[PDB]
Structures are given as structure tokens and as C-alpha cells.
Amino acid sequence: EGMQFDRGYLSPYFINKPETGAVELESPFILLADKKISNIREMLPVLEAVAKAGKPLLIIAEDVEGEALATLVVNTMRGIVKVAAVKAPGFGDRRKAMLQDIATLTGGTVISEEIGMELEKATLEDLGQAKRVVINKDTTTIIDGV
């Protein structure tokens, strides 16, 4: 099954289809975080595991800013990783419910800080998957999730 929501790329530098100005990831892993990511350190483990696995990564979180955002962009440009980041849809309680929906749709697990989950301890089994993902300035489309 697929889904779509009104949240565009957090940076035009995630674009990998110049002509159209879109982001297209094939058979990617999907990280679902209910927190704001500002320090990349806590991300290294999952990033390494995904990079070593040879798959692209879509990040859906509260936000991805500062150094965090910058390193993701620079290392995708350097070909060390291939990732894209967007904010979670909706607000408040609706955001949590929708984030959980995507998880179920993709067989992923929401890394909830509320219930005390650590991103450093996140594993590939916690990540979701889908056949394809398309992102533009305004929307994110998940195609055929596991």
C-alpha cells in the first residue's frame, strides 16, 4: 500500500532528479523518529548500518536541523550515504497517529523518545521499507510499503 502527505524535502540538496526537481529513492529504508534531530552523533550507527547495506534512507522526524541536516546533505553529495529528510505530517496527537500509520504501512517501528527509545540503539529491523519514495517541494509519496 502507498501513502502521501503534505511535507516536502527539508533541503533542495536531497534532490537527485534535477530536471524535475524531485527526490526519488528506490527500495529505501525508512526511519521514523518522534523527536527533533540536531546532533548527527546519535545517528551514526543507523547510518553506517544502512550505508553498509547499500540502501537509500528516508528520514521522517519532528525536524532535522543544524549540523545534522548539513552532514546528511554533504555525505549524500559525497556518495557515502544516500538520504532524504522530511518532517512528520500533522501536529500534536494527530502527528503521532499518522507517524504510527506510516510505520504499520511500511513494517517499521517508531523510535519514540516518549517511551524512552534511543536512536543510537536503533536497528535495521526497526526501519521500514517500501518499493519507492518520491519527494518534491510540497509532498512525500510512499509507494508499495512492505
Partner: peptide, 11 residues
């Protein structure tokens, strides 16, 4: 900025 053994450049 440092570079992990696998080449990831970060602060």
C-alpha cells in the same frame, strides 16, 4: 570535522 572509518564526514 572528522571522518568515520567508513568515510562519513561530521562535526
Amino acid at each position: 570535522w572528522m571522518t568515520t572509518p567508513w568515510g562519513f564526514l561530521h562535526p
